[PDB]
Scaffold this active site. Structure first.
Site, PDB file in Angstrom:
ATOM      1  N   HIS A   1     -11.588   8.648   2.894  1.00 59.84           N
ATOM      2  CA  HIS A   1     -10.672   8.247   4.330  1.00 59.84           C
ATOM      3  C   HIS A   1     -10.643   9.290   5.127  1.00 59.84           C
ATOM      4  CE1 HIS A   1      -9.918   5.542   0.762  1.00 59.84           C
ATOM      5  NE2 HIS A   1     -10.024   4.492   1.580  1.00 59.84           N
TER       6      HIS A   1
ATOM      7  N   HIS B   1      -2.370  10.779   4.625  1.00 61.85           N
ATOM      8  CA  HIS B   1      -2.180   9.862   5.533  1.00 61.85           C
ATOM      9  C   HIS B   1      -0.787   9.682   5.896  1.00 61.85           C
ATOM     10  CE1 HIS B   1      -5.883   8.030   4.844  1.00 61.85           C
ATOM     11  NE2 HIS B   1      -5.745   7.450   3.702  1.00 61.85           N
TER      12      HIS B   1
ATOM     13  N   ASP C   1       0.867  -1.436  -0.024  1.00 62.25           N
ATOM     14  CA  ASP C   1      -0.006  -0.210   0.251  1.00 62.25           C
ATOM     15  C   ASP C   1       0.888   1.336  -0.103  1.00 62.25           C
ATOM     16  OD1 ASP C   1      -2.712  -0.909   0.020  1.00 62.25           O
ATOM     17  OD2 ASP C   1      -2.327  -1.764   2.001  1.00 62.25           O
TER      18      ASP C   1
HETATM   19  C1  LIG Z   1      -6.884   1.881  -1.762  1.00 60.32           C
HETATM   20  N1  LIG Z   1      -6.096   1.837  -0.398  1.00 60.32           N
HETATM   21  C2  LIG Z   1      -6.088   0.625   0.295  1.00 60.32           C
HETATM   22  C3  LIG Z   1      -5.692   1.093   1.495  1.00 60.32           C
HETATM   23  C4  LIG Z   1      -5.078   0.034   2.541  1.00 60.32           C
HETATM   24  O1  LIG Z   1      -3.811   0.235   2.931  1.00 60.32           O
HETATM   25  C5  LIG Z   1      -5.934  -1.208   3.339  1.00 60.32           C
HETATM   26  C6  LIG Z   1      -7.423  -1.380   3.387  1.00 60.32           C
HETATM   27  C7  LIG Z   1      -7.654  -2.675   4.096  1.00 60.32           C
HETATM   28  C8  LIG Z   1      -8.997  -3.288   4.412  1.00 60.32           C
HETATM   29  C9  LIG Z   1     -10.253  -2.655   3.694  1.00 60.32           C
HETATM   30  C10 LIG Z   1      -9.920  -1.714   2.739  1.00 60.32           C
HETATM   31  C11 LIG Z   1      -8.779  -0.861   2.507  1.00 60.32           C
HETATM   32  C12 LIG Z   1      -5.803   2.458   1.832  1.00 60.32           C
HETATM   33  C13 LIG Z   1      -6.129   3.052   0.664  1.00 60.32           C
HETATM   34  C14 LIG Z   1      -6.451   4.323   0.425  1.00 60.32           C
HETATM   35  C15 LIG Z   1      -6.149   5.589   0.924  1.00 60.32           C
HETATM   36  C16 LIG Z   1      -6.744   7.094   0.178  1.00 60.32           C
HETATM   37  O2  LIG Z   1      -6.994   7.237  -0.826  1.00 60.32           O
HETATM   38  N2  LIG Z   1      -6.483   8.005   1.206  1.00 60.32           N
HETATM   39  O3  LIG Z   1      -6.683   9.338   0.650  1.00 60.32           O
HETATM   40  K   LIG Z   2     -11.813  12.794   4.865  1.00 57.79           K
HETATM   41 ZN   LIG Z   3      -8.968   8.045   0.118  1.00 59.90          ZN
END
Ligand SMILES: Cn1cc(C(=O)Cc2ccccc2)cc1/C=C/C(=O)NO
Ligand SMILES: [K+]
Ligand SMILES: [Zn+2]
Ligand SMILES: [K+]
Ligand SMILES: [Zn+2]
EC number: 3.5.1.98
Length: 366
Positions: free
Chosen positions: A168, A131, A89
């Site tokens: 998120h 993040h 990730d």
């Molecule tokens: C696509 N993506 C995957 C992750 C993970 O690391 C884990 C994860 C685990 C269980 C269910 C759903 C996701 C974090 C994002 C995006 C963050 C974002 O766009 N921030 O602005």
């Molecule tokens: K937000």
């Molecule tokens: Zn997001």
């Protein structure tokens, strides 16, 4: 001026395109904003690639340096990766350092322009990497430009407000300023078991003298433009009264829009737009950021539509022929239609939250 600053540079767009999870997205967006020739109504500005020292205003040297090494290589083995977040990730591919620096600089530039009275609104759709921790990548965020911009901004402005509308929760940015009262963070996001980062309930408020200076509104799947604005415009009203910001950094990740792989919210750029309008109306200096957005075509439509809003311009449905025209199949229109899933947002639990919040925002006054 009254004219918005649009951070852009063909070099920069190319740089942003190299990101794994969202290939060619940066281009697709600029391309579409250009096709509606909105750029003509804005002030273009080249991104001042963040200096090692500027990025270090929030990230540990140890981290920035390690991020650098790996960038000039391929993280060869490095079992220490996990210690800094580089993994799946957050793939530590080659030349990402320059990637980070490029973006963080752009956002910093945006903030500079706002500071120098050059405009009331500065845009950087590439930014919004909320993040990233002070020393550990997280969910595709290797550098936290969001924070950097806030820091650079605090040079001129006393109280700064960060509103995060990405799907998120904006953990990284929130933490950075969890203990202070100079910066307030408002975050609307899906909060559920397993859903990343899984942080920021509504009981999350901040610590020490930063207590009640972190507001989090946990939403549930299916939410549409209707309720979302109600909820948002509600919170933003309180926050405004009780905080009286001097400047604003708004992250608009489009991973909340219907059709995004994330399949959680059921929003359309029009809704997010209304929230944008509501903030803009405060006419404080505002720094706009992108972020999540993974249904590329849609992400482009969304941010382009929003750019339109920022210019008080009305765009036509017909998607203007351009380099990526093909991608907006099969209707080639700007509008997005909410899918047909139920809105699991029980109105009791919601009002329950909006009180809990305004209640906490009561202290902020006192
Ligand atoms: C696509 N993506 C995957 C992750 C993970 O690391 C884990 C994860 C685990 C269980 C269910 C759903 C996701 C974090 C994002 C995006 C963050 C974002 O766009 N921030 O602005
Ligand atoms: K937000
Ligand atoms: Zn997001
Ligand atoms: K805070
Ligand atoms: Zn490593």
């Amino acid at each position: 001026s009254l004219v918005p600053v649009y951070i852009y540079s063909p070099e920069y767009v190319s740089m942003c395109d190299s990101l794994a999870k969202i290939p060619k997205r940066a281009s697709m967006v600029h391309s579409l904003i250009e096709a509606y020739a909105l750029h003509k109504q804005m002030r273009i500005v080249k991104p001042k690639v963040a200096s090692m020292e500027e990025m270090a205003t929030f990230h540990t040297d140890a981290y920035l340096q390690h991020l650098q090494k790996v960038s000039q290589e391929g993280d060869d083995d490095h079992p220490d990766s996990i210690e800094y977040g580089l993994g799946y990730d957050c793939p530590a591919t080659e030349g990402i350092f320059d990637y980070a620096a490029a973006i963080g600089g752009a956002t910093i530039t945006a903030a500079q322009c706002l500071i120098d009275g050059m405009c009331k609104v500065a845009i950087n759709w590439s930014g919004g990497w909320h993040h990233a921790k002070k020393d550990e990548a997280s969910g595709f965020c290797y550098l936290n430009d969001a924070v950097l911009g806030i820091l650079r901004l605090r040079r001129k402005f006393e109280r700064i407000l960060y509103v995060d509308l990405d799907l998120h929760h904006g953990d990284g940015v929130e933490d950075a300023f969890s203990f202070t009262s100079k910066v307030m963070t408002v975050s609307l996001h899906k909060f559920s078991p397993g859903f990343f980062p899984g942080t920021g309930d509504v009981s999350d408020v901040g610590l020490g003298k930063g207590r009640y200076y972190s507001v989090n509104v946990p939403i549930q799947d299916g939410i549409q433009d209707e309720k979302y604005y109600q909820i948002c415009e509600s919170v933003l009203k309180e926050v405004y009264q009780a905080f009286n910001p001097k400047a604003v950094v708004l992250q608009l990740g489009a991973d909340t829009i219907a059709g995004d792989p994330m399949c959680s919210f059921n929003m359309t750029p029009v809704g997010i737009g209304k929230c944008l309008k509501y903030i803009l109306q405060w006419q404080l200096a505002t720094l706009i950021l992108g972020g999540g957005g993974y249904n590329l075509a849609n992400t482009a439509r969304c941010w382009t539509y929003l750019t339109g809003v920022i210019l008080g311009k009305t765009l036509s449905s017909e998607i203007p022929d351009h380099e990526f025209f093909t991608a907006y199949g099969p209707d080639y229109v700007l509008e997005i239609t909410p899918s047909c899933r139920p809105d699991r947002n029980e109105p009791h639990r919601i009002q329950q939250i909006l009180n809990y919040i305004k209640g906490n925002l009561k202290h902020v006054v006192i």
